Curated annotation (Swiss-Prot), chain C:
Name of the protein: Fatty acid synthase subunit beta
Entire protein: shown range: 992 to 1061 of 2051
Family of this protein: Belongs to the fungal fatty acid synthetase subunit beta family.
Miscellaneous remark of the record: Present with 91800 molecules/cell in log phase SD medium.
Physiological role: Fatty acid synthetase catalyzes the formation of long-chain fatty acids from acetyl-CoA, malonyl-CoA and NADPH. The beta subunit contains domains for: [acyl-carrier-protein] acetyltransferase and malonyltransferase, S-acyl fatty acid synthase thioesterase, enoyl-[acyl-carrier-protein] reductase, and 3-hydroxypalmitoyl-[acyl-carrier-protein] dehydratase.
Subunit field text: [Alpha(6)beta(6)] hexamers of two multifunctional subunits (alpha and beta).
Curated annotation (Swiss-Prot), chain D:
Post-translational modification: 4'-phosphopantetheine is transferred from CoA to a specific serine of the Acyl carrier domain by the C-terminal PPT domain. This modification is essential for activity because fatty acids are bound in thioester linkage to the sulfhydryl of the prosthetic group.
Full-protein positions shown: 1018 to 1113 of 1887
Organism of derivation: Saccharomyces cerevisiae (strain ATCC 204508 / S288c)
Lineage: Eukaryota, Fungi, Dikarya, Ascomycota, Saccharomycotina
Subunit structure: [Alpha(6)beta(6)] hexamers of two multifunctional subunits (alpha and beta).
Annotated coiled-coil segments of the chain: none
Miscellaneous: Present with 17000 molecules/cell in log phase SD medium.
Gene that produces this protein: FAS2
Function: Fatty acid synthetase catalyzes the formation of long-chain fatty acids from acetyl-CoA, malonyl-CoA and NADPH. The alpha subunit contains domains for: acyl carrier protein, 3-oxoacyl-[acyl-carrier-protein] reductase, and 3-oxoacyl-[acyl-carrier-protein] synthase. This subunit coordinates the binding of the six beta subunits to the enzyme complex.
Designated name of the protein: Fatty acid synthase subunit alpha
Family the UniProt entry places it in: Belongs to the thiolase-like superfamily. Fungal fatty acid synthetase subunit alpha family.
């Protein structure tokens, strides 16, 4: 049906150059906590 | 087994009595929901007043075995 | 910096429930066996306060007689 | 600014992780192979008494016998590869 489509995905690290030191730091801390919680959830849900 | 034991009224023993009168006596179907509800209170009392503290306590912060790291 | 894997939590609880072992000096989880964890092996802490959180008698269980205490 | 915050898939090589491992490295690591075995139902998780002694870990879904992570690959790699990816159409997955 002539459905052409193109998407471009840029590296995530080009985003972090658009914010401040403090904002990046607090964001990183929050992703670290979220990553730990998500690892916990994923493995628990996997086994059970 | 529910037998009487006389013990000195230490803070741990008073916690033991309180749990006997508010948690242990309850039926089996009712024990899990009440433990879930009073998890924070039970953990606080175990850490403050009982010889067997809550294990998942890191630098005084009540935590969980799933919420603490291997170190 | 890595929370316990759920497999390792299950292993930790099973080896807390290991019979050929001194009962652990803590409650690992709050579940149906919480009474067992709370009450089991509650006598030695009276004579071994050095193995207590603050070496506090208030945490331990000392059997004693109310009339003989006079 | 739009950011792909999360992603996943269900495909002929299981999840995005297992598909990516098969795409890049051409083989499954221990983690990828255990994920594939769990996906395919080769290994299930058991926790509690098993044959008397207390067992915690992966077992064989059919025989229920304990299976170690080291042996997951040696026991299920051939089956995973045979029944993953592009392969002969299986009538049992498309109603005979």
């Amino acid at each position: 049906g002539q459905k052409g489509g193109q998407a471009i995905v840029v590296h995530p690290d080009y985003l972090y150059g658009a914010i401040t030191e403090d904002r990046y730091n607090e964001y990183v801390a929050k992703v670290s906590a979220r990553e730990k919680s998500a690892y916990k959830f994923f493995h628990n849900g996997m086994i059970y | 087994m529910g037998e009487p034991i006389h013990k000195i009224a230490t803070r741990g023993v008073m916690l033991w009595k309180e749990f006997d009168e508010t948690i242990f006596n309850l039926p089996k179907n009712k024990l899990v929901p009440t433990l879930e509800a009073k998890r924070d209170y039970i953990i606080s009392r175990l850490n403050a007043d009982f010889q067997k503290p809550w294990f998942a306590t890191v630098n005084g912060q009540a935590r969980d075995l799933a919420t603490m790291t291997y170190e | 910096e890595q929370f316990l894997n759920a497999q390792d939590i299950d292993h930790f609880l099973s080896m807390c429930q290991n019979p050929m072992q001194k009962p652990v000096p803590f409650v690992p989880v709050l579940d149906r066996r919480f009474e067992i964890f709370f009450k089991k092996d509650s006598l030695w802490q009276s004579e071994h306060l050095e193995a207590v959180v603050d070496q506090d008698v208030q945490r331990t269980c000392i059997l004693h007689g109310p009339v003989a205490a006079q | 600014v739009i950011v792909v915050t999360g992603f996943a898939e269900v495909g002929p090589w299981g999840s995005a992780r297992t598909r990516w491992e098969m795409e890049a490295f051409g083989e499954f690591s221990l983690e990828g192979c255990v994920e594939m075995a769990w996906i395919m139902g080769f290994i299930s998780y058991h926790n509690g008494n098993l044959k008397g002694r207390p067992y915690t870990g992966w077992v064989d879904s059919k025989t229920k016998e304990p299976v170690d992570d080291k042996d997951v690959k040696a026991k299920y790699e051939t089956s995973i590869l045979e029944h993953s990816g592009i392969r002969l159409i299986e009538p049992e997955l498309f109603n005979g």
